[PDB]
Structure formats: C-alpha cells, structure tokens
Amino acid sequence: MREVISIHVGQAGVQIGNGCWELYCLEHGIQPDGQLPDAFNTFFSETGAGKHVPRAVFVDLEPTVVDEVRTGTYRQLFHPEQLISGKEDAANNYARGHYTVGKEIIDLTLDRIRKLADQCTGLQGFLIFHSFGGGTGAGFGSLLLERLSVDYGKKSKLEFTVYPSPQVSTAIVEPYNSILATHSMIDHSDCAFMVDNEALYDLCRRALDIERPTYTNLNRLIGQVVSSLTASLRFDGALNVDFTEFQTNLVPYARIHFPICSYAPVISAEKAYHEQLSVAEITNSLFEPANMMVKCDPRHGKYMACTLLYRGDVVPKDVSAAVATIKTKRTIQFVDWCPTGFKMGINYQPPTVVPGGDLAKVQRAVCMLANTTAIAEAWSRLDHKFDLMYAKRAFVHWYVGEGMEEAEFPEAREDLALLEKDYDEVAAES
Amino acid sequence: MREVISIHVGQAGVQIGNGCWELYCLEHGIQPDGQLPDAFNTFFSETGAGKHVPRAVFVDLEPTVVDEVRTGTYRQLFHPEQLISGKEDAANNYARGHYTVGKEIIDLTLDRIRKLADQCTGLQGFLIFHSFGGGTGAGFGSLLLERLSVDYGKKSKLEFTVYPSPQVSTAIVEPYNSILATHSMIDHSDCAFMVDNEALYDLCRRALDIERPTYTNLNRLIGQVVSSLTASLRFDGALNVDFTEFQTNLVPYARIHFPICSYAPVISAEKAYHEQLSVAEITNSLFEPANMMVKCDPRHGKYMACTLLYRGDVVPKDVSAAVATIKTKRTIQFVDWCPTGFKMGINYQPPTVVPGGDLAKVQRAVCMLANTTAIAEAWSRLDHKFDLMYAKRAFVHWYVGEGMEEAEFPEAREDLALLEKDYDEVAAES
Amino acid sequence: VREIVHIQAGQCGNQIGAKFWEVISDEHGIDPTGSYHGDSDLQLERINVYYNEATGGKYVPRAILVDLEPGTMDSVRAGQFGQLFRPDNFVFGQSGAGNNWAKGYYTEGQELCESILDVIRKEAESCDCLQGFQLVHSLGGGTGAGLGTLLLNKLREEYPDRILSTYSIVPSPKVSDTVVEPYNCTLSVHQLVESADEVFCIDNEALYDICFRTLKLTTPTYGDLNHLVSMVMSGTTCALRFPGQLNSDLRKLAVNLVPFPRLHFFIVGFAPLTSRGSQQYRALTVPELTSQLFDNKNMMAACDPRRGVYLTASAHFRGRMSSKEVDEQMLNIQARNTSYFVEWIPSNVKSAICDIPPRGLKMAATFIGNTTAFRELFTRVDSQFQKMYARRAFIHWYVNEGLETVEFDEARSNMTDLIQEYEMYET
Amino acid sequence: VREIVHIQAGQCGNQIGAKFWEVISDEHGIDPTGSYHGDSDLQLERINVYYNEATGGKYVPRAILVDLEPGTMDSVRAGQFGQLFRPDNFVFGQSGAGNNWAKGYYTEGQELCESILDVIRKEAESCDCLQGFQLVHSLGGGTGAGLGTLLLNKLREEYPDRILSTYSIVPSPKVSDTVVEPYNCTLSVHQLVESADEVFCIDNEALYDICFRTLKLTTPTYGDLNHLVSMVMSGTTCALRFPGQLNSDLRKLAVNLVPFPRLHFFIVGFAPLTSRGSQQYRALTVPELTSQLFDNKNMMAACDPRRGVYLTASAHFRGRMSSKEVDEQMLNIQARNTSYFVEWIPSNVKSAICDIPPRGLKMAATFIGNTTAFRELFTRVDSQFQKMYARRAFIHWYVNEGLETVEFDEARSNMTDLIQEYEMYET
Amino acid sequence: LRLAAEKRAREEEDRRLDLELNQYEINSTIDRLNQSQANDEAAAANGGSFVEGKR
Numbered sequence A, B: 001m002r003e004v005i006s007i008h009v010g011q012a013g014v015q016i017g018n019g020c021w022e023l024y025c026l027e028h029g030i031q032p033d034g035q036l037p038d039a040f041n042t043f044f045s046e047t048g049a050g051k052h053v054p055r056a057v058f059v060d061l062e063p064t065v066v067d068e069v070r071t072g073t074y075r076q077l078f079h080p081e082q083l084i085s086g087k088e089d090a091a092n093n094y095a096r097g098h099y100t101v102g103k104e105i106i107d108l109t110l111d112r113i114r115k116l117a118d119q120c121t122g123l124q125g126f127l128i129f130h131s132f133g134g135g136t137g138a139g140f141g142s143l144l145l146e147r148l149s150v151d152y153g154k155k156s157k158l159e160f161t162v163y164p165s166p167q168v169s170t171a172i173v174e175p176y177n178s179i180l181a182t183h184s185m186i187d188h189s190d191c192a193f194m195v196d197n198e199a200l201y202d203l204c205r206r207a208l209d210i211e212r213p214t215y216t217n218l219n220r221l222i223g224q225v226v227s228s229l230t231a232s233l234r235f236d237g238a239l240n241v242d243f244t245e246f247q248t249n250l251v252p253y254a255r256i257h258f259p260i261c262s263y264a265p266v267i268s269a270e271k272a273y274h275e276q277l278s279v280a281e282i283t284n285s286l287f288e289p290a291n292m293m294v295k296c297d298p299r300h301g302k303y304m305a306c307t308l309l310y311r312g313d314v315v316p317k318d319v320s321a322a323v324a325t326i327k328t329k330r331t332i333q334f335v336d337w338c339p340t341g342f343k344m345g346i347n348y349q350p351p352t353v354v355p356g357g358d359l360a361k362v363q364r365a366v367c368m369l370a371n372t373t374a375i376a377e378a379w380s381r382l383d384h385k386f387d388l389m390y391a392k393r394a395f396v397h398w399y400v401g402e403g404m405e406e407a408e409f410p411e412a413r414e415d416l417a418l419l420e421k422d423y424d425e426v427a428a429e430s
Numbered sequence C, D: 001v002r003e004i005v006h007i008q009a010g011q012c013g014n015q016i017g018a019k020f021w022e023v024i025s026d027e028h029g030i031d032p033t034g035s036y037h038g039d040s041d042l043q044l045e046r047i048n049v050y051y052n053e054a055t056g057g058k059y060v061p062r063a064i065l066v067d068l069e070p071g072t073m074d075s076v077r078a079g080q081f082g083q084l085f086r087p088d089n090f091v092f093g094q095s096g097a098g099n100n101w102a103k104g105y106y107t108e109g110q111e112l113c114e115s116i117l118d119v120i121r122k123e124a125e126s127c128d129c130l131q132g133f134q135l136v137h138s139l140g141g142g143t144g145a146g147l148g149t150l151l152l153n154k155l156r157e158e159y160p161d162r163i164l165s166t167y168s169i170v171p172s173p174k175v176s177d178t179v180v181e182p183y184n185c186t187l188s189v190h191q192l193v194e195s196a197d198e199v200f201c202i203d204n205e206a207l208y209d210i211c212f213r214t215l216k217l218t219t220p221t222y223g224d225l226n227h228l229v230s231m232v233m234s235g236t237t238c239a240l241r242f243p244g245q246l247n248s249d250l251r252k253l254a255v256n257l258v259p260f261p262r263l264h265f266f267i268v269g270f271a272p273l274t275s276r277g278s279q280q281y282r283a284l285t286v287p288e289l290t291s292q293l294f295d296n297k298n299m300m301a302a303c304d305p306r307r308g309v310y311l312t313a314s315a316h317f318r319g320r321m322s323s324k325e326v327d328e329q330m331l332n333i334q335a336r337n338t339s340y341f342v343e344w345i346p347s348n349v350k351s352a353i354c355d356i357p358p359r360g361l362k363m364a365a366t367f368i369g370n371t372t373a374f375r376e377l378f379t380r381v382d383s384q385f386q387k388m389y390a391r392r393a394f395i396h397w398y399v400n401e402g403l404e405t406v407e408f409d410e411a412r413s414n415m416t417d418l419i420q421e422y423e424m425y426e427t
Numbered sequence E: 001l002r003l004a005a006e007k008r009a010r011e012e013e014d015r016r017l018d019l020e021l022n023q024y025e026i027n028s029t030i031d032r033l034n035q036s037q038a039n040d041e042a043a044a045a046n047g048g049s050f051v052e053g054k055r
C-alpha cells in the first residue's frame, strides 16, 4: 500500500522512538508483545498467525541504550536483526563517528534497511532522527544519508533532528559538530524538521503543568507530531496530504528547506475543562511565539508557505475562516512572492492518549509545519559560537587525530556562510 | 450577541471585582461553581459542559489580593489564566509600575485580554477599574491604556476609578501619582467615571444605616451602579441605551469627559418601610449634594448633559413629569448651550439584593450620570497639594531612580494646568 | 515570596533575635522542635518569608548569628528555641570582643568578614526572590557596632537594590554600661547614613520608663524589655505574611516616610500596652489605640516629639476593624495638633490595615514616625565625644589598632552635618 | 563491555585501592568470598567491566598489586577483602623502597617491570574489549612516583589507543612527611605530561579540611581519606556500569574537557557529604547538590579556583531526577559567575545523568574541573626544588644510582613551561 | 475532571516516596563501617592495639 521506514540513530533518536512506537501500537490496538486482544500495514509487517513486527532500525555505537529495549517490555515486538549496537561510542567526536568507528558498522546497517524495504512494496519516504550535538547523531548520520542518496535516489528522505539550544548546552564541542553535519545534511536531505530542548522545556512547563519534566515527557510530545504528520496515510479524512506534497509545498529553493514545527492544543486537564477549543482558537494558538518548538521569534523574520493539518470533527468552512482571520494579523509577516501562503489538511481520527500521560482528551487538534527566515537568527548564533573556538584552535587536535582533515573546518564554515547569505537574500525585498 | 470585557487592576480593582461578580452571579442565577440549580453572553461564555466563565481579567503586581480569590469560594468559577499576579508590588511608585516592574508583565497581560476578545463576537467596549494613588493602579494602568489604544482603536474603553478624597488620604505620595496618571488617561480614555471614598463613607453612614463600614460595603454600592449601567444591554426595557450612546451624549469635548455618579434610593430596610418612594421622589433625591458619590457640591458649578437610568416599575409617563419638575428647580443650573440637557433610559428588571446585604428590596430605583463643572474644585485641591511637595521636591529621587526623567514632572503639571483653565472657558457663556 | 535574611550581631543582637523567634514561632504555630502543630491554614500561606523547610516537615529560620566571643552563643542554645537554628550559621571568633570599635572593625572583623559573607550567600541565593535583609545590633558596644558597620558596606556593594533594614539601640543619656560609648557611636553613624536604607532607633531608658509607667512591672528583666522590641519587628513584616484590607510592605514605607536620602532615622511605638489593673476599665476601641500611639510617653526612643516637628508619620493596624474609623482618626489627630507638622507636606500620616492580630489581643497597632526631634539624641553624644576628644583619652587603645586620628574628625563632621540638615528642614 | 585494568603501586595506592574494592563490591553486591548474593538483576548486567568470573560463581577483580617491599602486600592480605584478589597478581620485590626516585625507576624498577608488564598482559588480553587503564599512586614517594612513571611509559608503548587515566596525590603545601619530595615530584612530572591522557590531582591537606569542616570527624584516619577519594573513582566510571538518560564515558570526558594536548590535569570533588546529626537540618534537592559541587571548600585539591579562571567543567548526577532541573542548574552557575569562565569557550559546563545512585544515598554527584589555578601548586614545588638544587644538597643520593645532573635541569624546564602555558591562556 | 483528580493522587504518592529520604539519613548515620561513627578499630586491648595498620 503506502509505507514509511523509520531509522533511529544515537540516544536522542532511539529514546524518542521508544515513545513513538508505544503511541503507534496503542493507537491501532496491538499489544506490546505484537498480538491483538486497518492501517496496521503502513508501519508494521504481519509475519503471520496473529503477530506484527514494526518497520524500524535501532542503531547506536554503544549498547547501553539499545539493551534497555532488549530487556524492556517491547523486547517481544522487535526483530533482533533490527536492534544494532556498536562497541564504543563516538565520544561526541564527529571524526570518530564518521571516519574511524562509523565505517566499521555502516555496511551491516545498510543491508538491514535495504532488506526491510524488500518487504516494503510501496515505499514513499524515510524518517530519520538525530541530535546535532552528538558524535553519532552527526558523524554517523552524515555517513548514513550520503549512502542512502545513491542507494535509493529520488525518494523523499525526511528527518527529525534536535537543533542545539541557544543557552542550554550539554556538550562543549557542540558548535563544532553542528557545522560539520550541516554540510552533509544540506545537499542530501529532502527536508529536515527543527526542534530544540529549550523551547520544549518551557512549553512542557507553561501549557502542560509539570514542575520538573524529564526526557520522557518531551519524547511523547514529538511522537504526537509524527503521528499527526503520518495520519493522512493511515486514517480517512477530507484533504489528504502525501509525503511528496510536503517536499514541493514547503521549500521554495534547494537550500532553504529547514522548517519549524508546532502543535495545538497542548493543555492540561484542568485548563481544558475551561477552554472551548474550537477551530478558531486552536488556529490562533499556533502562531504565538510561545507555542513554537524552536526558541526563535518569528517576528524577527518573515514567513514563507506553511502547512496545516487538522485531526478531528473539523468542518472545512471553519478552516477557511480561521486562516483568513490569520491573514488579518498585521503582526504576522508574509513574503510578497508567496501570496498563496498555505496548504490545508483535514483528517477524522482524533488525537490519542497514553496511560500515565500528560495531555488532555481533546476532540480536535492541529499540527503546524512552518518555513520562515527567522531561523537565520539561529544560524548566526551557532556561527558565532564556532568562531571563538576555532580562532584559537580550541579542539582541533581531537578531530584531526581521528582521521579528519583540517581542510574541512574552513570549508564547512564556508558552506554555512553561503546558507546565511541565502536566507536574508531570500527575505530581501521583492 | 453583545459583549463587554472587564479588567481589574490593583487592590482596589480586584476586591471591587469579586464584589461585582458576586452580584452578577446571584443576579443571573448561576452558582459560584458555574453550574445552574438569557443574557449570559453579555458577561459570560459557555465552556465545555454547561459550565460558564466570566469575561474578566484580574491583574496585580503582588499575589496577596489575587491569592484570596484563588483559595476563595469563587475559585472554581475563574479560569486560572485570568488571575495574573506579579512578584513585588509598585510600592505606591508610579515609575516603578510604569517602567521597571510594569514592563516585566505588560506583554503577558495583553495576550490574555486579546485572546479573550477572540471569543467576543460582538464586542462593544471594556470596563477598567483603578485607584489613582496606587502605583499599580496608576503606573501600570496608564501603560495598559496606552497599549490598548493602538491595539483596538475604535472601541469604547470606559473606566471606573476612585478619585483621591479631599481630606482622607492613605498615601503621602498620592498627589504625584494622580497627576502623572492624569496626563496618560486624558488622551486615551473615551470616558472615565469619578467616585471617592470620603463621599461613599458619608452616604453609607447617613442614608444607608451603618455605624462602622469597611471597604466591603463600599464595593457592593459600586456594583449596583455598574449593574444598572449594563442593565440596558442585558434585560428588556422601554428605552435602551448602548455603551456608544454614553460616549456621545455626556461629553461635550475631548478632554472634559469626566462625569460623576449618583444613585437613589439608598435606604435601609427599616426606613424603606416608611415611604412609597415614587418616581418623583427618587429623581429629587438624585440631585441633592448629599447623595453625590463625589464630595464636590454642584451648586459651586453648572451642569452639562446628564444621563438618567431607571429600573423596575417606572412608567414612561411618570419620567417625563419628573424631569420637567427638575428643570423648574432653580437650585439646579445648566449651561445655556445645553437646553435639552438629558438622556433617559427605562429598564424593567429591578435591582438584586444580596445575602448579608445592606440595602432594601426596592422595586423602583434610579441611577444618575452627570457631567458638571464642580469637578474643577477637585482638580485645584489636587494641584495645590502637588505644588507644595514639588517646590521643595520632597519625593523626586524615588521616581527618577526607577526610570522616570524629571522633565515629565512639569509636563504633567502643565497638562493639568491647561485642563484647569479648560474648565473655566467652558464655564463661561455667550 | 518576598524572603528576608536575618542577621544578629553581638550580645544585644543575639538576645533580641532569640526572643524574636519565640514570638514568630508561636505566631505561625511552630513547635520548638521545628514541626508545624498549628491551628489555622493561613499560617502556612506565607511562612516562606522567614523559613526554609527541611524534608520531614521541619522548618528552619533564615538566621545568621555573629559574635567575636562564643560566650553568648552557648547561652542562646541553652534557651528553649535554640535547637531550631541551623548549626552551620553559627559564625563566631575565638578572641575577646574588647569593647573596641576599631579592634572589631580592623583586626578581628577582617578575619570573620570573609566567612560571614558566604554564609550570607547561602541563604540569600537559596530563595526564589529576595526583598531585603534585617540587621539587629547595638551601637554602644564593639562587636555589633564595629563589625555590623563593615558588613553593612559589603551587603550594599553586592546587593544594592535590596532593603537593608537595620534596628539599632542607642547609648543612654543618664546611666550607660560603657565608658567609651561616644567613640563607638560617633564612628558607627558614618556607615549607617550612607549605606542602610531604613534605621530604627531604640533607647533603653524609654523601655524602662514604659515598664514602670504603663505596665507597672515591679521587677522588669531584659526579657520583658526585649519582648517589647520584638513586637515592632513582628508588626512591620506582618503585611508580608498575612492578608489585609490595605497592604503596605517595607518598600512602601521607605518611599512614603523618607523624603530625602539621608533623612531616614525613625522612632517607633506599640499600642495597646495595658496595665494589669486598668484592663477592666479600658474599652478597646480604634480611637483608644490612636491615643496611645501618638502619646509621647509610649515612644520607645527618649526623644520628645513635642520639642520638634513631624515630617511623616505611619500607623499599622492589626485585626478586623472599620476602614472608615481608622481613616477618620488620622484626620482627627492631624487636624487637632497642626503645630507639630510641616506645612509643605500635606497628609503627613500614612495608614494601613492588616487582618490578623497577635495572639490574645483582638486589636493592636504599630507606629513608625520621622521627626526633627533626633537633633536631641545626636547633640547628646556629640557633646560627650567633644570633651572626651578635646584632650586625648582612651584613644590610644584605638590608635594601636590601625585607626587614624583623622577618622574621628571625619566621623564628627558627617555627624554634625546631619544635625544641621534636620535644622534646615524644620523651616 | 568496556573493561578497565586497575594497578596499585606503592603504599598510598595499595591502601586506597583496598578501600576502593569495598565500595564497588557493596555497590554490586558481591560477598567478600567473591560470590554473588546481591539484590537486583541490574548489578549483573555489566559486572564484566571490573571483574572476572571464576567457574563456580566466584568473581575475581582485574587488579594488579605492585610494591618494592612486601610490607604492604601482607597488610592487604590480612584485610577484610584480601582473599578477593588473585594470588598470582601479587608482584613485589625484596628490597627497601629507599624513597628514591632514581633507585625505583632505574635500579629496582627494571627487574620488576618485565614481570609486571606480563602480569598486565594476561588480564588485558583476556577480555573482549579494553577501553583504558587505571593507576593509583603518589607523586612524592619513591616507589609510586618512580615506578608508576616507568610503567606508564611502557603501557603507552604497547597500548597507544587506550585511555591511561591515573589518580595521584600531590605533596601538601604546609606539612608533608618527607624531606626530599620536591626532587621526586619534579622528576615524575616530565613523564606524566607526555604519556598519561587523564591525571587527577588530590591533596591530603584538603582531605583533612573537608573532614573537619563538613564531616566534623575529630580524628580522621587514613580510612576516611581513602574512602572519600574512592567515591570519585566510583563516580567517574559509573556511566559504563549502569544505564542512564545521558551517557558520558571516559572518552566523552577527554574530548570535552581538554582543549589542548598538555592541559589535562584535573581537580575533583564529590557531593553530598553528611554532617553528623546536622543532616536532619538539610533538605536535599538537586539545587542543593549544585551548591556543594561548585562550593570551593568541597574541592579535594588545595588550589583555590577563585584565584584562577575555569576552562572546562563537568558534573555527573546519579539517581532519578529531572533533566530540565540539571540543565537549568549548569546554566545558572555559569551565568551568575561569568568572571571565572573564559569568553572564547562558551558553555563551559558539561552535564550528565545516571539512573542508579550509590547505596545509602537517593542521589549523589561528582564534579571534575580544569582550571588555571594549578599554577599555584606547581609554583610551590618549583620553589622548593630551586633553593634545594642551588645548594646541591641531597643530590648526592640520586647521583650514586646513575642519574645525571642534566636531568634535573630538563625536569624543571618542562615543569616551568607547563606553568607558562597556563599563564598565557588566561588571556 | 477525573484525570485532574487522578493527577493529584499521583503527586501525593510521589511526595510520600520523596519523604522516605528520612530512611537514608538513617543509613548515613548508622554507617559505622564507613566510620562516620568513628569505630576505634582493631582491638585496642593493651596487649596490642592493632590488627590492620591503617585500620
């Protein structure tokens, strides 16, 4: 039929994938063991009898995170060939995850993903998860995309990556790693969505009433976005949006593809008791700077085309009035050479809840993917962080010692400057 | 339908507000929890299930007054977003609530008032409460009005403020805050009603029978005036008056807008047993200096246009005879260019009495809104008090250190000085 | 969430402060072991202003105790509520006090200064917000007078915005417990004027006079005297801890009462103080409190307001009472005694109402006023200092510590100028 | 599967390691007889890191014991956990230590080294993987200072890729227990700079100061000091043994913390520590751990961070806690104290979280920092070496073993160059 | 509504297991092996005083 392949790389990918497959299995009604107590086939394969197996590949260069799944409840769900573990991690070193260690396991990895696609008759895209700061998320993720570009060609490769936060930082060598991975992402990826932990933390505190969240709560938020993102292929609705429609509608040029994500309503039980949450309200919640999952102000730049997806008992008349109302907002700036500005989507399957969850049981919800020049503010930040370290040659010896050439450091800086030129030139006057 | 939004600032605004909503909820027939044991749309919205919610926002820079509502019986009525509390109060300092602390919370508030206006299908005005002497009442109130003016524009923003008393005073810096706030109010506000505590003390002791009142009794008296003021929009009547009519009918010029308040009959339940209290009686009681809610004698000045609001059993025939009689009274003056001089309205629903209430159950009552030049007496007293302290500059250093430039102090004095002689030109005749 | 950090210095500060926590602990309802065994929910509303909670339901005060000799400390722990304090906030030296201001300021102060500031840093940066600090010390001694002023500069340097409220005890005119007091008081005044925001002045003689005139105590001890002072400290911060009809915290008080940066020295008084035989005759009404507060005998400082003129006045009321009745009394007393108020400031009386009273009393009041009568108290110490300094005296004890003789001249010059400043504003 | 080889050389290293195995065995639940009797399945997940299993359920550590005289080997043999170790791993000489660096490195080291290296070889080649080595030794003695450097050079020759992390104790600044330490430490510094990837410096004096100030221990024996140091070894490698939300192994730490090849000396610390009986006054939360970790008094090395500036810092957290809470605390401490961190490195603080805290604590933390304050310590030893070397003095005892006088000048030259390199990067 | 009241029940359970931490102050003090108790080890009886050197 129609189907998507999910690959999880590094801790930040597989830990999100744990939350995604919990949500996916419980939404369709499959027990964690893979049996039953429809749209099953877009994400699972039916081995026979009454058992189901996901289309997922779990990979990290160190076995601690993966062995949690092998020992956890979901151990009965996955096929052990899918669960791939290396020996020693990349030590937050791009060169170690790309040049020395990465090439030891890449060909074993590529056989499994290709094998999984043979059972896949109607493949239409890939979903890949990264963390930019990590050695494996950036070093090995770059090596993965470079090969999949020639292995599969003109198939949309969508990514879900955690972009480094403005102030919250857990790796000192983080600014070095993002620029190196930026060069490899920019040519091969069809479109890569942006999220960051710093905005998710504030969102997980203000709207959802949690005093002290963990990585677990943030992972359920991201799983909801992907579930809403892929629901058009699974459930019935009124305006279906395929994977290829994202590729053309969202990105105007080759190198301006990076979007940002949003979701609404994200609300607790007590507040949703008071709020009506009709179509007009949820559409207004999307455009506030607080709901953005990237801590960048949209008011700094301007908007290119955005894509809107509605899940619930939503009537098309209300959708048109909402966006027409949005166009009346003079605080929202759109670029003149995009007077169309929008694509809509409607589906009938409401959002789904989880035991021990954090969210409210709403009848309708909307998910937003937006392309804006505001994230040029984010790149100029990361470029400046790189400049201070490399001016004094702050961490070059570690990268060069593991096979990396120094010549890549200025080149990766050069490509980013071209990207910085491309954004404000796009945002320039008609 | 037709809606009005209420905004409450500071200690005075908040605890007036919970007094008013105690009245409205009792009047309309809704429990404090929002359930039932019509004109709901004018003040309330219907949430999920049959629960209702006020169209009100409570704002203060310190949590004590707001937290009383949060733990009170009415806590389940309000949406927790509506109750906004700052960290540390303005310390009766206009600069502290305008520049330093006010700008820390201004933008959070403006989202909540704007978001509540989206649910306002037929919005026609706002109601805003102040106390002039307070830092948050004046400083943050001015900033709120300044922002709100450009946000909405052609919407009638009505204010209901407490003018500092001629002699009763609780703050030494009280004259400074009132004059600085006056310059901001005069340009932005459509119309603002004056009352003072000293007159409300005298009325609640003389006419209404209490030896020793508190602020609780005074707040209930204010709620009656607003209840009759909005009764035209809610319940049936032989002569309806909308909010926009009050703006046009009362104020002759831009800057002379300030009216004063009166209400009749204010009578204890033993005294109400004596007299029939016909229409002519209550109209005559309105115009005596004893019943004025501002302690300035109108006989010192002259009357421009007055607005009268009748509630209950009144018949339009009796109204015409009463006002004709009042024109014959030679203790009442009118400027010559106001021969008509009156706006009248009649509504059928009588006032509502309260458990633990003070007033009687009278079935015909009248409220008066009148614009008079006798208010110019109040400005001169306030202006005199400002000059004594400013000559030796008794408190400039506190305001300057908190972000004010000194040059604003003479400007607000000048703008008041023009208003003082503005009143004398209008007081003249040709 | 307007936390306040409490610092006690010297023999005077530790005994006043220790009695201070007995008052608050019973007000909020904390058992001396530190557990809540109260009677009302309103007590736990805003106990965060003064306490931290140890996991287990045990509450710890934000107290820092400072002295040069450990003799007074073990007398505090011997007290009933001494177990409450955190053991590590006990900061003390191993040398005699010396009763010397220079010795405390230069020799032993520097060694203890660095350790004390970090102890301050722990409590100051452990809370969500910080309004100001609270210092208790006397000026006649050497420990609280000397080291207290040094710490007051460091607190101002690090934390300029916060309110540095201090409570001071002034050396007495007639009988006093130290020969070299004019040297200690004169030097300390320079640091108070420029650094602290609010200063409250208490005289020991007035405390005796109130006990014998009003309370009719046949044998007053320092416990009864310190009980009176703790009430005023409790009253000022009551607006932070409990709801009220008209709120007024510290920063309101400083803005209204202080017209110019240097004029911020205050006198206090507490009503009602009822004789044990007059209770059956006195009917408690709001005007009855007004009579006691503005009565000259009730003032805790031995400076007569009638000899000077008022600049500002402030009254705090506790309990459920009429707002009209309170406001009418301020007008009444102002208009009936017009000769004692300055013309160029109208409405010189500030007022407030707080809902919850002290235990046992169904209504009580607190008074804080600022007046030109302070010229009396400073002229007193200036005259004694001049004669003790015209000829040299014990001064060699201060010179042998590092203090220069020019510092005394600077100390008198600044002190003299503050006397003239109050002279000018009387006109 | 990231096995680590542990080597104990000298008196100081042997006794620290003996306590260090008591910490692990309790944390994993291995009976002193080498058998498993624990309580959780998670303990058997990755026991292979530190232990070998003998057929029969008997677990044997990867430990190698080295000394020049048999005195300490018999002391460990009589210890509570003495039977745990493998008897063939005991390698020792039959000569006095001599307290001589040259004698240990040249005269007796060579004969022992060929046997010791083969003892390393059976264990290093026996396991599936080998990430790095672990050495415990002093830098003021004759056996640890000399022979430890010799084995470190040889281990670098055979295993270039692996992480040669060592744990060293520096001679104290005020009182020390040997006349000729400055010669010993200076000669050893040349080897450690070029061969060892990670070096952690610990001072005995700071260990005593922690004992009185926090632990209140009136008489701290060498058991307490070694136990405190044993906490840090257990904390660093805990990320390998137990799962967590954010894994950070040794090589993650090296790349993050070390900006340049030669600046890799580290100061360490641990939190929380229990004040006797005063733990009832403390509410332990994540912010409280942050207070102790970046408190300068909890540092285990007697070099003040405040007199220098920071380059990189790293904190581990153990237990079930919030990830937002951790990341907000690191940002808070870096923003509030900008003066001590370098501009040309943003985000100077790394963070990590582990799931399972040690027994006895519901949460714990480890702090590792790299700062310019090491210049204080190296100035100390260089100064004593200089005034000893000018007189010549005790060189008579090193020359008669075969050490040229040219080696003293070279050793100082490299030591002084290391000090300058920290000076320059302060700009 | 139910999910909100359910949510507060979970918090109260979480605070109970937070307040358990008084248990591990007991271990911290009762830790005699770790010599927060100051054991006076190795059989001081004046025939000798020692069994294990550092003890």
Ligand SMILES: Nc1nc2c(ncn2[C@@H]2O[C@H](COP(=O)(O)OP(=O)(O)OP(=O)(O)O)[C@@H](O)[C@H]2O)c(=O)[nH]1
Pocket: A009, A010, A011, A012, A015, A016, A060, A061, A089, A090, A091, A092, A093, A131, A132, A133, A134, A135, A136, A137, A138, A162, A170, A171, A197, A215, A216, A218, A219, D245, D246
């Ligand atoms: N949302 C989310 N982010 C995570 C999670 N775990 C780690 N991260 C993020 O991942 C970022 C760093 O990347 P790494 O954790 O090093 O991932 P990696 O690609 O495996 O890198 P290596 O461990 O060195 O191989 C941090 O900024 C974290 O915010 C998680 O469970 N959920």
Ligand SMILES: Nc1nc2c(ncn2[C@@H]2O[C@H](COP(=O)(O)OP(=O)(O)OP(=O)(O)O)[C@@H](O)[C@H]2O)c(=O)[nH]1
Pocket: B009, B010, B011, B012, B013, B015, B016, B060, B061, B089, B090, B091, B092, B093, B131, B132, B133, B134, B135, B136, B137, B138, B162, B170, B197, B215, B216, B218, B219, C245, C246, C247
């Ligand atoms: N009628 C009436 N007036 C009140 C009431 N409470 C306070 N006031 C008046 O309010 C004035 C003082 O200002 P506040 O009410 O404290 O207003 P505010 O903005 O909160 O002042 P801040 O505390 O600085 O924030 C005084 O003149 C009082 O007379 C009340 O309950 N009823």
Ligand SMILES: Nc1nc2c(ncn2[C@@H]2O[C@H](COP(=O)(O)OP(=O)(O)O)[C@@H](O)[C@H]2O)c(=O)[nH]1
Pocket: C009, C010, C011, C012, C015, C016, C097, C099, C138, C140, C141, C142, C143, C144, C145, C169, C176, C177, C178, C204, C222, C225, C226
């Ligand atoms: N009001 C009051 N005064 C006290 C108390 N204890 C001591 N004093 C007086 O405070 C003055 C100065 O005390 P001193 O010991 O010099 O304090 P220190 O030098 O700051 O430590 C002495 O004259 C004492 O008589 C007390 O409990 N209450």
Ligand SMILES: Nc1nc2c(ncn2[C@@H]2O[C@H](COP(=O)(O)OP(=O)(O)O)[C@@H](O)[C@H]2O)c(=O)[nH]1
Pocket: D009, D010, D011, D012, D015, D016, D097, D099, D138, D140, D141, D142, D143, D144, D145, D169, D176, D177, D178, D204, D222, D225, D226, E054
């Ligand atoms: N922390 C600690 N230090 C010790 C212990 N025993 C000795 N030391 C210190 O280690 C330093 C040198 O040890 P030394 O005996 O020369 O070791 P050697 O090189 O093997 O001879 C001395 O200054 C001792 O103070 C111990 O058990 N623990």
Ligand SMILES: [Mg+2]
Pocket: A010, A011, A060, A061, A062, A089, A090, A134, A135, A136, A137
């Ligand atoms: Mg990884």
Ligand SMILES: [Mg+2]
Pocket: B009, B010, B011, B060, B061, B062, B089, B090, B134, B136, B137
């Ligand atoms: Mg307020």
